[PDB]
Amino acid sequence: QFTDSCLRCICKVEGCDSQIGKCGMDVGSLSCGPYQIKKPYWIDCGKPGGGYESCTKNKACSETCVRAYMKRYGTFCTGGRTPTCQDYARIHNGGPRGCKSSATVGYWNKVQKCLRGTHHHH
Amino acid sequence: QFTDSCLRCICKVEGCDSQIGKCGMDVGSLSCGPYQIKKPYWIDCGKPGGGYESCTKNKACSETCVRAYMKRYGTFCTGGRTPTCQDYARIHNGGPRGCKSSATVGYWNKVQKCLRGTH
Ligand code: NA
Ligand code: NA
Ligand code: NA
């Protein structure tokens, strides 16, 4: 399963509560809210809520989206393998192929640091 | 992407190599070859090869057809969402709207068992 702990650590890496209500530009695209979701991701997760920005600025709608995204793409990305949080986090960062991409490994390392509590600061 | 694993499991569910060179009726109309392709599907994939049966009886020409059909119809069927193998398999069985049909759910269940090794 895609667990709440996995989801929370993805949130922390992306910025989480400090980004509620907020958008910025990333690589030419608007990216909004605690999970830093771009419009293609919101389309891919099934367009929850009332619209792109209104959903993705909001924590609850963003979480609905992320969970739907992981259900839709997890086993797709892995090629039928049971996915783990490593897969889900790498999918979040890199898209539906992200679990296989070298581009998402550093992102996973940040999520894993959160999950495993390493070099933790107050 | 439409992957080779997805293509292979579609092939297996349809009968695959046992159907090379063969046609038969399939829910009311002719289907041919390892992927059980009907003539409207062969038109919709761009009429590859020399003709309907001559292409679709053959594994390689059938695969050209299937690959073109998935590219043509995948994101159309999903309404702009990145397609998965579930979408592609369901499009194969049910046409350009197959990814959102009922009627294609049992077909996916069979393909999924192939992909997960359960089956
Ligand atoms: Na934060
Ligand atoms: Na991102
Ligand atoms: Na069929």
Residue numbers in the entry:
A (entry chain A): 21 to 142
B (entry chain B): 21 to 139
Which statements did the authors publish about this structure?
Destabilase from the medical leech Hirudo medicinalis belongs to the family of i-type lysozymes. It has two different enzymatic activities: microbial cell walls destruction (muramidase activity), and dissolution of the stabilized fibrin (isopeptidase activity). The main difference between low and high salt structures as well as between the two chains of high salt structure is tied to a flexible loop (Gly44-Ser51), containing enzymatically important Asp46. Together with Glu34, Asp46 forms a catalytic dyad for muramidase activity in i-type lysozymes.
